[PDB]
Design a protein around this ligand. Structure first.
Ligand SMILES: [Cl-]
Ligand SMILES: [Cl-]
Lengths: 158, 158
């Protein structure tokens, strides 16, 4: 499998897991590069939506292939990333869901909650996530297409 | 606490849990009414985004207060509902996340994966979800506001 470009992002609640995950994935041959959009310190109180939107925009703009995002629960970052046109984001803490996020949902964004999941489980799930690749000709693609159809309703004016 | 109007939705993969959840919540004094957008049979192969968008639109349009959604993993419905302006949707399978979905994210939509969570845990989490009510004056509101700010970029033309 070809390696993928990743963005990684967290808020102040997700810093230590982000660092551990970044270290874990920097030796992985399925990862070509990691773009860290921050935050880089627990002292940085920047609200999670800014970091999630920045990392999601990197995908939309062709600068990375996927983004891994960490906050207290992993929920706020997932909500925020889904507001970006063409971006599909999930919070997932089990091996079956992480597989389906790719193979069913073609979701470019995976989110974790540092306060709710353990770090070894998170590392394991991130590694598995990279091994799945969405099939554009699958039956799931017709379902993803209905999400894309709805997104056609909107134009970005600002 | 005043009772809330709920919408409920599933695809074919979430029918039995949806029925059990609906039965569970129909006796609950925190629920004023349940609007079921379907599907109502495993024979109905309608793709999850249609049902998720319909139920999310009920919230946007002031017909219900929140929506509970069920599919195989709970991920596709959450992604879809988040595409609707002003709607914030999560997949959550633990008591801490379900609390924060309300108290931090003001998320009107909660999603479950029938194939990954057990029915008694799902029933328990749905009951707890109703007991939390978002505080518009909380510090979390300023974070939710950044998501709303981003949504201001888009106009619905179709
Ligand atoms: Cl697991
Ligand atoms: Cl739990």
């Amino acid at each position: 499998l070809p390696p993928l470009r990743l963005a990684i992002a967290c808020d102040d609640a997700g810093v230590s897991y982000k660092e551990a995950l970044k270290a874990h994935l920097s030796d992985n041959p399925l990862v070509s590069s990691i773009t860290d959009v921050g935050v880089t310190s627990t002292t940085d109180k920047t609200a999670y939506p800014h970091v999630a939107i920045q990392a999601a925009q990197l995908i939309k703009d062709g600068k990375v292939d996927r983004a891994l995002m960490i906050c207290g629960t992993g929920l706020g970052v997932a909500i925020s990333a889904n507001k970006v046109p063409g971006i599909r984001a999930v919070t997932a803490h089990d091996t079956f869901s992480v597989e389906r996020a790719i193979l069913s949902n073609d979701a470019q964004v995976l989110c974790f909650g540092q306060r709710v999941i353990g770090i070894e489980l998170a590392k394991r799930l991130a590694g598995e996530w990279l091994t799945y690749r969405f099939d554009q000709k699958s039956a799931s693609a017709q379902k993803v297409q209905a999400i894309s159809d709805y997104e056609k309703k909107f134009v970005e004016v600002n």
